[PDB]
Amino acid sequence: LSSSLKTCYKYLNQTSRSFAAVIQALDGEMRNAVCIFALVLRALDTLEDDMTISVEKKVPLLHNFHSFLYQPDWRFMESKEKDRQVLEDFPTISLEFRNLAEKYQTVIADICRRMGIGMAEFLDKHVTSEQEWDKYCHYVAGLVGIGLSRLFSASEFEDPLVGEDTERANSMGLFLQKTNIIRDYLEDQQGGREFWPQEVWSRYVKKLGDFAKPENIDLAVQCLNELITNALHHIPDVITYLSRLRNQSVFNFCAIPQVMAIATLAACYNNQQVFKGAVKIRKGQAVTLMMDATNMPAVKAIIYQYMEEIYHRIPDSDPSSSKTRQIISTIRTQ
Numbered sequence: 001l002s003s004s005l006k007t008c009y010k011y012l013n014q015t016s017r018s019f020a021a022v023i024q025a026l027d028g029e030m031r032n033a034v035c036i037f038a039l040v041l042r043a044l045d046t047l048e049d050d051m052t053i054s055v056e057k058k059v060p061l062l063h064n065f066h067s068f069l070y071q072p073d074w075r076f077m078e079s080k081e082k083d084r085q086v087l088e089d090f091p092t093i094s095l096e097f098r099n100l101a102e103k104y105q106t107v108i109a110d111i112c113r114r115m116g117i118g119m120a121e122f123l124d125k126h127v128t129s130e131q132e133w134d135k136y137c138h139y140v141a142g143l144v145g146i147g148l149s150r151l152f153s154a155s156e157f158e159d160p161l162v163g164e165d166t167e168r169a170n171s172m173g174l175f176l177q178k179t180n181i182i183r184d185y186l187e188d189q190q191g192g193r194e195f196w197p198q199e200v201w202s203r204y205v206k207k208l209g210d211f212a213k214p215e216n217i218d219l220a221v222q223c224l225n226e227l228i229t230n231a232l233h234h235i236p237d238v239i240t241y242l243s244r245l246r247n248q249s250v251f252n253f254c255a256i257p258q259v260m261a262i263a264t265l266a267a268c269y270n271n272q273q274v275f276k277g278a279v280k281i282r283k284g285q286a287v288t289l290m291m292d293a294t295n296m297p298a299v300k301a302i303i304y305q306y307m308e309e310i311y312h313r314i315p316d317s318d319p320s321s322s323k324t325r326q327i328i329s330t331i332r333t334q
């Protein structure tokens with residue numbers, strides 16, 4: 001490997017810890033392509049997340065980010081985010097980007113372009129409806145699934161269908177992102193960011209921050225269960241998507257994060273502790289189970305086990321209880 005590509009893998013291990021291992025195991029050309037895609041996405045997210053950058057300054061950066069990939073000299077030296085190194089040494093990443101086959105470059109730049117436009121749109125608004133929640137998730141995560149899928153198809157390790165079924169790929173991304181947002185209530189509230197959809201939480205409290213108040217814990221947990229229930233609706237699509245993958249390394253790459261997210265939602269379900277910080281995800285059980293789960297029947301058994309865990313904890317009085325049971329029964333029979 002070149003020194004620049006070695007550096008890129010260094011950055012991948014620092015900035016995308018949960019994905020680094022499955023990425024490095026990808027077959028052939030997919031490995032570098034996905035590594036670089038992850039790094040450019042990390043840089044773009046680091047811009048989006050940085051609240052020290054004014055909206056006025058941020059908007060052109062997000063819009064023009066895709067074009068920076070083709071400017072050998074471009075870097076950004078003003079980030080105060082923890083992953084700023086990928087911005088400050090962007091030339092190393094964009095160099096390796098321009099080393100990828102054109103077919104991968106085209107997908108990556110297209111997704112960066114579309115993601116930047118969408119991220120910019122949300123700088124001036126909160127998330128209101130459930131549809132707006134889906135829209136925000138599409139821009140920051142669904143498009144990643146779509147991009148990854150198009151990379152798989154372009155590589156020819158997977159069929160054209162994988163890249164073409166953008167709804168299924170979108171769902172894979174939405175599932176991870178909704179899980180992240182649900183899980184990260186308190187961290188986000190403390191950093192002054194709000195992602196829970198207003199049309200949902202405003203049925204419980206007047207301000208999203210009110211869920212951090214001990215007196216409101218029961219309403220907070222109802223809302224939590226409602227949002228989890230919404231996220232579970234993506235699982236049929238995740239099963240459909242995973243069922244089509246032919247290449248082992250791709251399957252592992254796609255399946256592992258989805259199972260980790262499922263385990264996270266199960267740990268979050270009906271759990272007051274979400275409102276007090278990080279929940280013990282029983283990450284370990286999931287990681288251990290996935291070692292052996294290299295095929296659809298094994299993946300399905302794990303999903304069913306986590307769904308059964310949620311199901312037997314559904315409170316009778318929970319306003320979402322009927323819906324939660326309904327989606328779990330759908331998942332079980334897919």
Ligand SMILES: CC(C)=CCC/C(C)=C\CC/C(C)=C\[C@@H]1[C@@H](COP(=O)(O)OP(=O)(O)O)[C@]1(C)CC/C=C(\C)CCC=C(C)C
Nearest residue numbers: 016019038041042045140141144145148169172173176254
């Ligand atoms: C390319 C690769 C492996 C990883 C990319 C991750 C990187 C480095 C940057 C992207 C940052 C953005 C914009 C969104 C979220 C990633 C975590 O960011 P984070 O900072 O925690 O969230 P936030 O800022 O909202 O708090 C996220 C969860 C996207 C996950 C979607 C996937 C993986 C598609 C699955 C679909 C199939 C596989 C069909």
Ligand SMILES: [Mn+2]
Nearest residue numbers: 045048049140
């Ligand atoms: Mn972000």
Ligand SMILES: [Mn+2]
Nearest residue numbers: 045046048049
């Ligand atoms: Mn982020």
Ligand SMILES: [Mn+2]
Nearest residue numbers: 180181184188
């Ligand atoms: Mn988050």
